Design a protein around this ligand. Structure first.
Ligand SMILES: Nc1ncnc2c1ncn2[C@@H]1O[C@H](COP(=O)(O)OP(=O)(O)OP(=O)(O)O)[C@@H](O)[C@H]1O
Ligand SMILES: Nc1ncnc2c1ncn2[C@@H]1O[C@H](COP(=O)(O)OP(=O)(O)OP(=O)(O)O)[C@@H](O)[C@H]1O
Ligand SMILES: Nc1ncnc2c1ncn2[C@@H]1O[C@H](COP(=O)(O)OP(=O)(O)OP(=O)(O)O)[C@@H](O)[C@H]1O
Ligand SMILES: Nc1ncnc2c1ncn2[C@@H]1O[C@H](COP(=O)(O)OP(=O)(O)OP(=O)(O)O)[C@@H](O)[C@H]1O
Ligand SMILES: [Mg+2]
Ligand SMILES: [Mg+2]
Ligand SMILES: [Mg+2]
Ligand SMILES: [Mg+2]
Ligand SMILES: [Mg+2]
Ligand SMILES: [Mg+2]
Ligand SMILES: [Mg+2]
Ligand SMILES: [Mg+2]
Lengths: 492, 485
């Protein structure tokens, strides 16, 4: 064809983007990675989605796992390949060794095997092929040279059969060689790499595309997650910056704060709250998530610091009954330690909840939690992720941070995430006469006017009470202020 | 001959400059690189370009990728190699293995195949040749020593045929051996290394001319981007310091500000709008992007922070409409996440849009939005990338930056780029009586005068209202002044 290479939609969440459309039609795609990296899950989903959505039959070749196991584990994702097999949509070409034994199985092996597949493809009238672990075929007594030629013998004949193919290969080191004999990376056109990089004691999983001949594809690692719906990727680096924005306002929970923002927050606008531990991030989150229920709008509350109980105790002591917010089915609390998963994990989880319950507000208390460990970048990416989604979804997200140091916060981010957020509220203690009192400012609003006053405030059983600035002080921001004025009242 | 080495032009964007002209004529060039770097593309473009600019024909000996494919993959770029092998200007030499089975045909090996290519050349009167994946030939059963002979046998056989050659090799370790059997390196007159380095879950293609027997060449790695129009290379080191400069002037969009700078900004200048988060860098941004329309000049506005829809929101709330602008084709908008491309890449996109919309003013709201998880160096390289081009291009660019700390920041830029820009505008807060009030202040201008004081300014529907300074104060810079009665 005088037309450039066309791809085949895989239907695997994210892959299509990274792959700018899917797997190059008519060609074989090498998909290597270490153990437990989802290589087989990759090929099964490929063949599968193609049957469920494009009614494209698929042939599955396996050189190790007995068909029975394959169908079994499929049930992990609620997949009854078993059926698609019985309706002729799926056909597993068992090519695994017998627990008995026969010598010299490399001569007729491939060639005879090729024709077998040819028969399979041709017979069931298929469009998708997955050959699981070609690596386990030359693992009899061969070396680099023999390997090379053999793949080319298979990638090519298959190519003559014109079927979109997926081959799986194993790896020994994580960032070491691409495949085993360091020879497939070439004899193949398209080489996808699924990693399970260590780092720390958490394992994060990326998926890359070293190359698709003739076409384009996002370059680099993008994390993905294996779940009850298979592989899920997150094209973090692909998400378009075209999110909608309204001029609509909503409330923060405390009306006086609703004034200092020029009439509330904007439905479409990420909101952060900073302060050293104790100022009151939570109190603001509390009244925030609450405010959203009194209007009949659902709002999830992900906490990573406090428990579900304690999150309902201290809450009560400020009035407001979460308990009721839950019953009416207008509030939802998640709670989960940060060391319970990697950022790639929470992001999906949060994204997940947002899909079932479809909140009207979002309140993640403590970006500072998730920031634990995880290198500054990895986290930064998380942030966009959350923010960028919640934004292009029209939800009001209040976030929380906690300055690494009380009094003297020379940086309202302590990780420089400022710029990602739209509204900024700042809490700070203030040493006023041997007494640490609260202060509260609306640092910046992107669409409104907001108040430029560094108002003090007190916390009681009602909640926050935004009073009057400290006009008669120098070095307020310094946390330890200074009294001014040198004239009282006397005669003329 | 009695004179210097005559090079041949590759026409490969930027390469002629890194090689100082092109490939040493009649001499082969070994271009290696791991899988997915473009080695094929490099050599296919080489032959190709020779066909559409010089009419110098080409022989593409292909050992592993099938002729038909070689032709198909080139359509990705808009290249009709099918048409060129018809017009007999390019010839693809099918030197691949049999998809079936045969072992006793290549017993004349190296020699036989050379006789072929030498025939074809004399038949199409070709001038350039590329052998794609020669390593794949030996990949039958050879030792480092068997290669050095076979290769030196070919290379030479092709030197004698006064043919200017480009052989392709493949690597396995990015910064390790140049080729597979660490032998080709010394067997070829010229060495080109293609690297797809990772480092930080991100890839970056860098090209390098290791050596060129004969003449000089640029030294080291240069970044490159594989795109519809093939290999594109930016020799940020080959860009001299020769930009036309003038005293003409332009407005900042804020009349006051124009006076503060001694009557508007200079046309041929890079202005920087540093400041804390919120100080209003994006306020001035829109401003300077609008005055370019009231004067019927095209102005592009590259965004990397706020949406295009949101921009068009806060725009309207400061007065001045952005909708109109675009319609009249006097204001183009961009938008993209800094993580949505690599620096090497972001750079090119700019150049791209510019060439297409011939702006007169460029706005890059937050260079500090790009520095994201990038190497201080890499990034400095990205500023000079833009800055320079916009200079030589006589464009007037406005760049936004946000310091990693409000009030007290002990530098204009935490990445130290100031000494790159000509005019630095500077926003910072100042705590006046339990309050947060803004304060603009031109910090420096290389050709003009510009006021020296820090005037407080307020923002409102109509815009930036630069007022008067904090005379009766002290340490207004320390963000928390001391009113001295
Ligand atoms: N429903 C599921 N939910 C969460 N994780 C799952 C689920 N099913 C499988 N996994 C995880 O996925 C992995 C299975 O990997 P998979 O079988 O897809 O391919 P592989 O390990 O790359 O290659 P191979 O098939 O040779 O083992 C397991 O390590 C397991 O932790
Ligand atoms: N019922 C109450 N009455 C008066 N003060 C209260 C009451 N509950 C909490 N406080 C005060 O509020 C602060 C608790 O902080 P809060 O619950 O708002 O979360 P935070 O400041 O955001 O985060 P963290 O406490 O984890 O640092 C304490 O410093 C305490 O003095
Ligand atoms: N039109 C295109 N647009 C964007 N990227 C492309 C396009 N065509 C190819 N590419 C990219 O360029 C790479 C092509 O490299 P190429 O196939 O030319 O040679 P190689 O990687 O050096 O050697 P080989 O692929 O033969 O093993 C692919 O990995 C792909 O990411
Ligand atoms: N219509 C308006 N009326 C009054 N004040 C406004 C208005 N719009 C914005 N502001 C003020 O301007 C600031 C907003 O900053 P702006 O939109 O100019 O971009 P920035 O300061 O350059 O960058 P960033 O938003 O990333 O911090 C807020 O801090 C706010 O006080
Ligand atoms: Mg396995
Ligand atoms: Mg497997
Ligand atoms: Mg290769
Ligand atoms: Mg807390
Ligand atoms: Mg190649
Ligand atoms: Mg030497
Ligand atoms: Mg900002
Ligand atoms: Mg901004």
């Amino acid at each position: 064809e005088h037309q450039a290479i066309a791809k085949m939609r895989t239907m695997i969440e994210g892959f299509d983007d990274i792959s700018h459309g899917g797997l190059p039609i008519g060609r074989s795609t090498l998909v290597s990675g270490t153990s437990g990296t989802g290589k087989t899950l990759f090929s099964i989903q490929f063949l599968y989605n193609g049957i469920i959505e494009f009614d494209e039959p698929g042939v599955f070749v396996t050189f190790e796992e007995t068909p029975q196991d394959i169908i079994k584990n499929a049930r992990s994702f609620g997949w009854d390949l078993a059926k698609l097999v019985d309706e002729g949509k799926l056909f597993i070409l068992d090519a695994s060794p017998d627990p008995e034994g026969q010598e010299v199985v490399g001569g007729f092996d491939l060639s005879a095997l090729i024709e077998r597949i040819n028969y399979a493809i041709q017979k069931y009238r298929a469009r998708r092929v997955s050959i699981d672990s070609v690596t386990s075929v030359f693992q009899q007594y061969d070396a680099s040279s023999v390997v090379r030629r053999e793949l080319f013998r298979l990638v090519a004949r298959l190519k003559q059969i014109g079927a979109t193919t997926v081959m799986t290969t194993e790896r020994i080191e994580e960032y070491g060689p691409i495949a085993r004999y360091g020879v497939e990376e070439f004899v193949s056109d398209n080489v996808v790499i699924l990693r399970n990089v260590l780092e720390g004691e958490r394992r994060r999983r990326t998926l890359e595309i070293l190359k698709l001949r003739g076409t384009s594809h996002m370059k680099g690692e993008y994390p993905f997650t294996i779940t009850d719906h298979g592989i899920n990727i997150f094209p973090l680096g692909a998400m378009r910056l075209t999110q909608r924005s309204s001029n609509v306002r909503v409330s923060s929970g405390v009306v006086r704060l609703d004034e200092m923002c020029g009439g509330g927050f904007f439905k479409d606008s990420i909101i952060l709250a900073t302060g050293a531990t104790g100022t009151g991030k939570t109190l603001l989150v509390s009244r925030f998530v609450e405010n959203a229920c009194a209007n009949k709008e659902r709002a999830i509350l992900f906490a990573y610091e406090e428990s579900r109980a304690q999150l309902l105790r201290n809450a009560y002591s400020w009035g407001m009954d979460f308990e009721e917010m839950e019953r009416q089915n207008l509030l939802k609390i998640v709670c989960a330690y940060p060391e319970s998963a990697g950022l790639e994990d929470h992001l999906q989880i949060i994204k997940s909840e947002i899909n079932d319950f479809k909140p009207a507000r979002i309140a993640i208390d403590s970006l500072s939690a998730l920031a634990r460990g995880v290198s500054n970048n990895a986290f930064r990416q998380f942030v966009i992720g959350v923010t960028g989604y919640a934004k292009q979804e029209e939800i009001t997200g209040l976030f929380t941070n906690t300055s690494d140091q009380f009094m003297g916060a020379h940086s309202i981010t302590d990780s420089h995430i400022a710029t990602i957020t739209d509204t900024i509220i700042l809490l700070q203690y203030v040493e006023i006469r041997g007494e640490m009192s609260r202060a509260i400012n609306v640092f910046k609003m992107r669409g409104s006017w907001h108040d430029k006053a560094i108002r003090e405030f007190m916390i009681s059983d009602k909640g926050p009470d935004i009073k009057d600035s400290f006009r008669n002080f120098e070095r307020i921001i310094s946390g330890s202020p200074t009294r001014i004025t040198v004239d009282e009242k006397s005669e003329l």
